[PDB]
Symmetry: C5
Subunit: 265 residues, 5 copies
């Protein structure tokens, strides 16, 4: 929809935005509540404190357009991002009361099992497609879940759409980034499943992701807002005694480089 013109250069034509997003694993400090499992598909009633959710934030950018009626206006364009999962080294902890290896004689199992890592940078909220494993699930009060009127919600029902517009409220397991939308967002996601799978987590300050599309255009920040989204499920913590499991998530740092872009109003 937007006719993109030339990059605007000169003093104060570029800025770097730094932010971090703390994980929303179901409680505030990096872990879900002990996860409970239904004995059948119905009733299946996951409590809110047991459901990892997407993290998201809108960063206000410097105001560009005193007059919004001119035939051309300026927009902040996200050119590149350096992003880092913070606290990776915490998973070298094998002393804090996990299930012990070597039949109880060795160290605690580290955080391990399914991993799901996603970050997104856009000029508007991340657009979501609803999809669930079990259409009979009762999602709790306090989360935004797709309506579940029939089993088509287990595959692609094009009626089930949302915008990631609240931090710690959209459960990861019932929403994915919508590939049919997000023209103005770049999202990067990986899932590695299995039971006791080793997490593989890099940490470096040397890797830049370019956000420019095929035509050399980055996300354009509507209303001078930059939208950051992520989830970083790093696996499960097993309690030594109960052997109950908790989702473990880690915070994510973002450094986004932006430039002014002229567009046709």
């Amino acid at each position: 929809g937007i006719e993109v013109l030339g990059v605007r250069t000169g003093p104060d034509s570029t800025t770097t935005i730094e932010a971090y997003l703390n994980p929303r694993m179901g409680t505030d400090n990096g872990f879900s509540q002990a996860v409970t499992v239904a004995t059948s598909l119905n009733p299946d009633v996951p409590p809110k404190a047991e459901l990892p959710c997407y993290s998201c934030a809108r960063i206000g950018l410097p105001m560009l357009n005193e007059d919004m009626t001119t035939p051309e206006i300026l927009m902040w364009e996200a050119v590149s991002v350096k992003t880092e999962v913070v606290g990776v080294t915490t998973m070298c902890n094998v002393h804090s009361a996990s299930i012990r290896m070597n039949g109880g004689y060795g160290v605690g199992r580290p955080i391990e099992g399914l991993n799901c890592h996603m970050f997104a940078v856009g000029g508007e909220p991340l657009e979501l497609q609803g999809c669930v494993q079990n259409w009979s699930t009762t999602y709790p009060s306090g989360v935004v879940a797709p309506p579940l009127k029939d089993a088509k919600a287990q595959v692609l029902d094009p009626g089930l759409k949302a915008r990631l517009d609240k931090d710690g409220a959209y459960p990861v397991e019932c929403w994915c980034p919508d590939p049919s939308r997000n023209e103005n967002t770049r999202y990067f996601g990986t899932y590695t499943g299995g039971q006791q799978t080793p997490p593989v987590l890099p940490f470096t300050n040397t890797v830049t992701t370019v956000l420019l599309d095929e035509n050399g255009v980055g996300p354009l920040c509507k209303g001078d807002g930059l939208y950051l989204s992520c989830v970083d499920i790093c696996g499960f913590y097993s309690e030594q005694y109960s052997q109950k499991q908790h989702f473990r998530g880690l915070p994510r740092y973002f450094s986004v480089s932006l430039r002014k872009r002229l567009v046709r109003n």
Copy 2:
């Protein structure tokens, strides 16, 4: 057989087609019926509801040639595709009545085990080669299976050919893309086997596959039809109580970029 001439440029000379294909795991909503296993190679009678099939669709394109008598005509040429498995994040669900880890105390096993992912874009139906694990298998009414007259069907019998011309009817286990044909289709497949293997599933809107061949020519859409095919087996769901297993499949999104191509009539 088609003499390919120059690309036709100018207004309305390009179009993007967006489509999704819901998985055909043997029932309509992402899962096979509980899979049964023969005690011997004969009789071996897999029910239709237990056999994953290829997904396919023909998308009608804008009509190009009201007059088909000219010495040159136009065909839509598929240049590139962005494709995404939708609902990957549903496999972060460990509460919906799966077999529990840590001897029954931990979370449910996630969907895991053998993965088979394929997508194809072509200007005609995907061409298939018949090949089976067990030539004594009785395939059910309601699926298209190769004739099984002898054990050569377990390897390459060049008599066993078909076109993927019906959605949810050609079982994955008795047909593969025919590498000896498919001049006018690009197909991309991976199988990762094993028992409890971690699924590894990316989800991003930043990856484009170019469909042009060695000569810079993409699939040419015969009769103004674009043909999309896929399968996305993501592993097995284990029922907590029975411990019976179901194939789990996920829907696939396609965005195909096309341009008009002049050809000799």
Copy 3:
């Protein structure tokens, strides 16, 4: 010692050869006989029907030379190959009488365990080096095995050489491609071992292997013969009842692009 001159261009100066090789796992239709294991290194008597062998074929090429006595002649030069393992999707079969997962309640184990994949394209037979795990093995009548006079056959004995000159007769376990020869053949092999290892098998029609050497020269077809070789061990099938194991192999398709090359006679 062939002096290679210019490529011959013009009408009929290029051709594509298409062929498939059915696997030789010890019986004709993709599986070994149930594999037996010696209780000691001597006697160790593997039956022929239990020993996977290399597949190979010589393709006769079109007549190139109206005269063989001229100071220059033409040879077919193999420039590139597209090759595909056929029937990969058969390994989505979990119903055909394999050992059942989840303590007998789940699906059959898929084909899994050690994988060995090799293809070769040359202008003469693949040259082999003899090497065995157990020099005391008695190889059966009907296979070509290296002489085993001492334990040096377990490492590199340069006296143990052969040419791959018969389909389904040279066991994989006692011959490998000779890196000290094969000047006029390109071979590409991978072994992935272990007990229950997931097979990882791509299937696409989009990947070309270039056969040109450092000097831009492909294999030159001596006697107008193109030589194709492969093995594709995809793992073991376990019988549900006996729990005996069979090698499973899959057929391989080749499409080789050739051009006429002038050489000094």
Copy 4:
């Protein structure tokens, strides 16, 4: 803060610094003390001898500026590094009193399990962010640990910062490289978790890491000091009898190439 001008070339304008850092696994000679595991999150009292720490060193460089009053001065600029984990081949040891495979009949388990590898090269101390798995942990006397006033220390609390300014004193599990700082340091880290995970360790003298940023500027050595940091946890040693586990770390070699850089004083 530093205005960077041209590279200074000519005789003695470049130097190579070679150094090694011995690992700090909790005792001096490559192993932690046998690791103990709390039965609950509180009390959780890891002894110092059981906590791997970062290695670090400041290397004095040739003094550049006898006169520090000129409008321009020289700084050593770190351009590239070759770095190697030393003693990788020690992990071919299966005789030194580890838990024996094949039910006690086979060789000892090699060093295996979680791996955490990081190296950093900078012109000042590595900047650290505090983050822990368990905010209730009591860190011992003799290590530098972040204050733990609340559970925010399990995620990102921006109040928890430090500089890596003492060798063998900053525990890996409560500090990570701060991605919001370290403008004048390059750090490269990988974590591979799990219980018995195979360590994958290259050793070659052929691989160079370039330390130049986006603008062609390497770390600038403040006070003519080069700062090297690392950790190389290679997994756990299991005692044959007790089955107690010890962290195993290996030393790291650095070769850093530097050049003189003019900067505005």
Copy 5:
């Protein structure tokens, strides 16, 4: 290179040569396998027999003599430009019939060779330089191998006093020596370790892959005294005996094809 002033490449007829060689593995006995490996019950005494210790393979290949007169202000050296190297006998590990521990509770085939893998090759103009490092400083290394002195526990990490040259085939145990990254200016070495208990070996075999040996300045190893030095180890995992369940290291031979050219240097 080191103290050598390197001048131009010498071209023309006979200015290049290819050296082909193979090195048979030294797993502790001569024919690809260690003796059944024994394990100490404690760190002291820990007495691995020589027949149970994999060692590095190495060879010096004599090259065509270049300088009958060694008094000229410039002389020629053979320069190693590239290598094609292959582990030979990879396909032997498709053997599941030769008396290994049987899978499926005794009903299936024998376990293939599997477990820890350690692969290294080196090409140089002088012997590979080694750094001493051990897992257990209390180990008693046997007569007939060259092991570093073990005076204290620093030998478990980096003790810069513990240095050697790989100057004898089948004598330097892999587990107490690694390539010295602080030396080997005139050698390129390439090593990988993949550990674990029953880990799948992943072994390519192709004749299409060339490793370039030129450094940052376009200079390959220079063959001092017209000698080319080849080193390797290829531990492919363990063989388990069906009855005893004792384990043996399995190693495979390595083939080298090294391309060399004449290089002018200042004498």
